[PDB]
Structures are given as structure tokens and as C-alpha cells.
Amino acid sequence: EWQENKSWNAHFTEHKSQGVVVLWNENKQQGFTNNLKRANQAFLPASTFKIPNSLIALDLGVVKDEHQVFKWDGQTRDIATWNRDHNLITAMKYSVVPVYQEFARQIGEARMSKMLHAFDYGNEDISGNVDSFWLDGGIRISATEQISFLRKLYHNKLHVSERSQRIVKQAMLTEANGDYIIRAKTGYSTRIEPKIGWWVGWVELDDNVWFFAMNMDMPTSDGLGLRQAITKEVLKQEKIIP
Amino acid sequence: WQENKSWNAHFTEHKSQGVVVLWNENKQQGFTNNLKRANQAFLPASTFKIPNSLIALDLGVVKDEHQVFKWDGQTRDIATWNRDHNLITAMKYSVVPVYQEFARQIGEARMSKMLHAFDYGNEDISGNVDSFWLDGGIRISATEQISFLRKLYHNKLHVSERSQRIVKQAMLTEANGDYIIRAKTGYSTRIEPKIGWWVGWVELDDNVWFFAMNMDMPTSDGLGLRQAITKEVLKQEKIIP
Numbered sequence: 001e002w003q004e005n006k007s008w009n010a011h012f013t014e015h016k017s018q019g020v021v022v023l024w025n026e027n028k029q030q031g032f033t034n035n036l037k038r039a040n041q042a043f044l045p046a047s048t049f050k051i052p053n054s055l056i057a058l059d060l061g062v063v064k065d066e067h068q069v070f071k072w073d074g075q076t077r078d079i080a081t082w083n084r085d086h087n088l089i090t091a092m093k094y095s096v097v098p099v100y101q102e103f104a105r106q107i108g109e110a111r112m113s114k115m116l117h118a119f120d121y122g123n124e125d126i127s128g129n130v131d132s133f134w135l136d137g138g139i140r141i142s143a144t145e146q147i148s149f150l151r152k153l154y155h156n157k158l159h160v161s162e163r164s165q166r167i168v169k170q171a172m173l174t175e176a177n178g179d180y181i182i183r184a185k186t187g188y189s190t191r192i193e194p195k196i197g198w199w200v201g202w203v204e205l206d207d208n209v210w211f212f213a214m215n216m217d218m219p220t221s222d223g224l225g226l227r228q229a230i231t232k233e234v235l236k237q238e239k240i241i242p
Numbered sequence: 243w244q245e246n247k248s249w250n251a252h253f254t255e256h257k258s259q260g261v262v263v264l265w266n267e268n269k270q271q272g273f274t275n276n277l278k279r280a281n282q283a284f285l286p287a288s289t290f291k292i293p294n295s296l297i298a299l300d301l302g303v304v305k306d307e308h309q310v311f312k313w314d315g316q317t318r319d320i321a322t323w324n325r326d327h328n329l330i331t332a333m334k335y336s337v338v339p340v341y342q343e344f345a346r347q348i349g350e351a352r353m354s355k356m357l358h359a360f361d362y363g364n365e366d367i368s369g370n371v372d373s374f375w376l377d378g379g380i381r382i383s384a385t386e387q388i389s390f391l392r393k394l395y396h397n398k399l400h401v402s403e404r405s406q407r408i409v410k411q412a413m414l415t416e417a418n419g420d421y422i423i424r425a426k427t428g429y430s431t432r433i434e435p436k437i438g439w440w441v442g443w444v445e446l447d448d449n450v451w452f453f454a455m456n457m458d459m460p461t462s463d464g465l466g467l468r469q470a471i472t473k474e475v476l477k478q479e480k481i482i483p
């Protein structure tokens with residue numbers, strides 16, 4: 001069912017980096033990774049949590065639809081793209097933490113906890129501030145657990161409405177062309193060691209879907225582009241994309 | 243409406259001619275290289291797969307975007323048609339026989355009513371129920387395409403929200419960190435003049451630009467110019483990098 005391919009480590013070491021890529025072939029129900037141990041080690045989800053947070057916010061009516069505007073609170077933050085109005089599409093795209101922190105406060109800890117249990121999401125533990133636990137609280141999730149969660153979303157099998165799931169998958173749109181469609185979410189965990197970067201999602205082909213989840217050590221923001229670059233090198237090696 | 247004839251340079255570069263029509267949604271302003279051709283109505287050809295999909299989904303002819311429509315075993319000229327398809331791939335490869343079967347299940351009565359509800363083109367389905375958008379009486383202009391697409395974008399067509407969301411998913415053509423294009427190609431060859439279509443929209447962070455283009459297309463060799471010329475216009479207008 002699972003196969004370890006250490007040759008993928010060549011894509012990590014050439015960028016003076018360390019991490020894991022996990023792939024799941026949906027048609028064949030087979031998994032592949034460069035590092036079986038790390039594939040199953042759990043980390044703070046950081047902004048990959050915007051996928052379940054979006055789902056919950058939509059299903060509860062906290063977010064009406066993908067056009068609703070969440071106005072900037074006027075607090076100038078370090079990431080420039082955060083300092084303006086957003087909707088669900090752009091808030092996901094730019095990983096706009098303050099928008100989702102407000103979602104979390106409106107959702108509340110009771111409903112948040114209940115929903116993550118229903119989602120079977122990670123360790124299901126929201127200990128910490130209700131509006132930052134995915135950044136510095138108790139929640140943890142592994143790459144293989146990310147894939148399990150994403151497979152449910154792809155198939156509309158999560159316990160929220162079909163509409164909520166369709167809207168979040170639209171908001172996850174990252175890249176598309178005549179060869180493939182990538183729906184995904186980046187993450188960057190900086191508050192608690194070890195600092196790591198994430199990229200989780202899937203690649204839609206004409207006749208199959210490949211789920212993926214990667215994380216890597218990220219001591220500085222300098223290497224954030226490596227999340228997508230290394231994943232795409234693995235996808236290219238495995239002939240999933242040209 | 244504003245006419246910018248300088249866009250014609252993008253057509254003459256390839257010894258071609260046609261029209262691109264743009265609509266700036268935020269500003270409610272339109273732009274085109276040729277106001278008269280912008281309003282000239284043609285057979286929609288495979289751009290008709292947008293309303294046809296909507297109707298098929300809303301009536302349950304298509305259950306969802308995963309349902310598989312098996313190849314009937316007839317070897318047709320376009321190789322990608324000779325295989326099983328779902329709604330996503332049928333739209334991607336403009337697989338006429340899949341949609342012809344849809345049209346038959348839908349029937350002329352329901353098709354006619356729906357196109358009237360959609361205010362679509364001249365709303366005329368005269369001809370074969372399974373080919374009228376290729377060689378029948380239906381006609382639509384580039385500006386009329388944009389009117390229809392704007393309703394779809396806003397989920398304002400008289401079909402369910404789910405049907406409209408699914409079709410907009412199936413229209414996905416290109417996406418990156420700068421833009422998202424949802425669109426549908428068309429190639430009208432059965433009746434003169436032979437023309438190529440590309441209609442859809444460009445999603446930006448803070449605006450949407452609707453577009454509809456058609457161009458003379460005497461041979462299939464120039465089909466790539468539909469997208470290429472459109473993107474040159476988009477580049478000139480600073481809509482995409």
C-alpha cells in the first residue's frame with residue numbers, strides 16, 4: 001500500500017533543505033513518500049487550517065459566500081497583502097490570518113471542537129486561544145492525516161453541506177492549465193519550533209487524482225517558494241505533470 | 243462602449259480578422275476593436291456547451307461532474323472524443339457526441355423553454371434537436387455572450403445555484419497567481435462563415451473582466467489564435483502580465 005522512494009531526497013538536499021513529500025494515487029489507492037517516519041509525524045497546521053476553518057465558517061453562515069467582503073481592521077501588519085479588504089478567495093490565496101481569526105471567534109470553541117471531531121481532523125485538539133490555536137496551540141496533524149482529510153473533501157464526504165465543500169474547493173484553486181489542476185493550501189508555522197513550511201492539496205488529471213501533502217524545515221522565510229518547487233519536482237519525476 | 247481599433251494589429255499580425263469584446267465588471271464599461279462585429283450574431287458552436295451543461299444538470303440528465311458517459315464505439319475524427327468522458331473532460335475536449343445525447347434527453351420543448359429563460363441569443367432552436375447549435379437556427383453575438391456569462395457568474399440564471407457552480411468549475415481553463423480564466427472554445431464549420439469562438443471571463447483579485455471573441459477560421463490550423471489574440475489584448479489592456 002505504501003512505498004518509500006528515497007530518490008526524492010535529491011530534490012530536498014539540492015536546496016540545502018529537509019522534509020517530506022507524500023503522494024496518494026486515488027485510482028490505485030497507493031501511497032508514496034521519501035520519508036515514511038516524517039510522513040506520519042505531526043506538526044501545527046498553521047495556515048493549512050484555513051481549509052477546515054473555511055468549511056466550518058461557511059456551513060455555520062459566518063461566511064455567506066465567496067464574495068462577502070471582510071474589511072481591513074486598519075491594523076498594519078507585517079504581510080502587506082493582509083492590509084486591505086478580502087473575500088474568501090483572496091483571504092485563502094494570501095493566507096490572511098486576521099480574517100480567519102475573526103472567523104474563529106465567531107465560530108467559538110464549542111462548535112470548532114465539535115466540527116474538528118466530526119472531520120476526524122488531526123489530533124482534534126484546539127487547546128489554546130480560540131483565534132490562534134492552529135498557530136501556537138495544541139492542534140497537530142501529519143502529512144498522511146492531511147491526505148485523509150483532503151480525500152473526504154474531494155469526495156464531498158465531510159459532515160458539512162455539499163455547497164460548503166464546493167466553495168472551499170473553488171477557493172483552494174491554485175494553478176490550472178491543459179495538463180492539470182492544482183487545488184491546495186500553503187502553510188508556514190513560525191511561532192513554535194520547529195519552524196516548517198507546508199503545501200497540501202491535490203492534482204486533478206483527466207482520469208485520476210493525486211493527493212499530496214508536504215512539509216519541510218523553514219528556518220527563514222527565504223525558502224518559502226521551495227514548498228511548491230520541491231513538490232513540483234517530485235510530481236515531474238513521477239510523470240504526474242510534464 | 244469604447245472602440246479601440248489598435249487591437250486590430252493583433253489580428254493582422256496573423257493575417258486574420260475578428261473581434262474581441264471586453265467587459266469591466268466593476269466599472270460597467272465595455273471595450274472592443276469592432277463595435278459592429280461585436281454585435282454580429284453567429285452559430286455558437288461548442289460555446290453552446292455552457293447553456294447545454296446548465297440545462298442537463300438542472301434536469302438531472304447529468305447527475306454531477308463525475309458521472310461517466312461511455313463512448314458509443316464510433317471512431318470519430320477527433321481522437322480525444324473516442325473514449326469515456328465526464329462533464330469536466332467533455333467540456334475540455336468539446337466532445338460533441340456526449341452533448342448531442344444530452345440534447346436528445348432534454349428534448350426540444352425543454353430546450354426551447356430554457357433558452358428563453360436564459361435570454362440566450364435569438365432563442366431559436368430550429369433544426370435537429372441534437373445539432374441546432376452547429377447547423378440550426380440559433381444565433382448569438384459576442385455582446386450577447388457577455389450578457390449571458392455575466393448572469394452565470396452571478397448565479398442569476400434560472401437554474402439552481404449548484405448547477406451554475408458545477409458548470410463554472412467545468413469551464414476552468416487556466417489559473418495562476420495572477421489570474422483565473424473560465425471559458426469555452428467553439429469552432430463553427432458546418433455553415434459559412436467558418437469562425438472560431440472563445441468566451442468566458444478573467445477573475446482578478448478585485449475585479450472580473452468578461453470576454454467574448456470570434457474570428458474568421460478557414461482552416462483548423464489557426465485555432466490556437468483564439469486564445470493567443472485574446473491574451474495579447476488582455477496584455478495590452480494591462481489585465482494580465
Ligand SMILES: O=C(O)c1ccc(/C=N/n2c(-c3ccc(Cl)cc3)n[nH]c2=S)cc1
Binds near residue numbers: 079095097187189
Ligand atoms: O504566525 C503567523 O501569524 C503567520 C506568519 C506568516 C504567515 C504566512 N506565511 N506565508 C507566506 C509569507 C510569509 C512571510 C512573508 Cl514576508 C511573505 C509570505 N507565504 N505563504 C505563507 S503560508 C501566516 C501566519
Ligand SMILES: O=C(O)c1ccc(/C=N/n2c(-c3ccc(Cl)cc3)n[nH]c2=S)cc1
Binds near residue numbers: 376
Ligand atoms: O462541427 C462539428 O461537429 C465540430 C467540429 C470540430 C469541433 C471541435 N473544434 N475544436 C477543436 C478542434 C478542431 C479540430 C481538431 Cl483536428 C482538433 C480540435 N478544438 N477546439 C475546438 S472547439 C467541434 C464540433
Ligand SMILES: [Cl-]
Binds near residue numbers: 170
Ligand atoms: Cl474551480
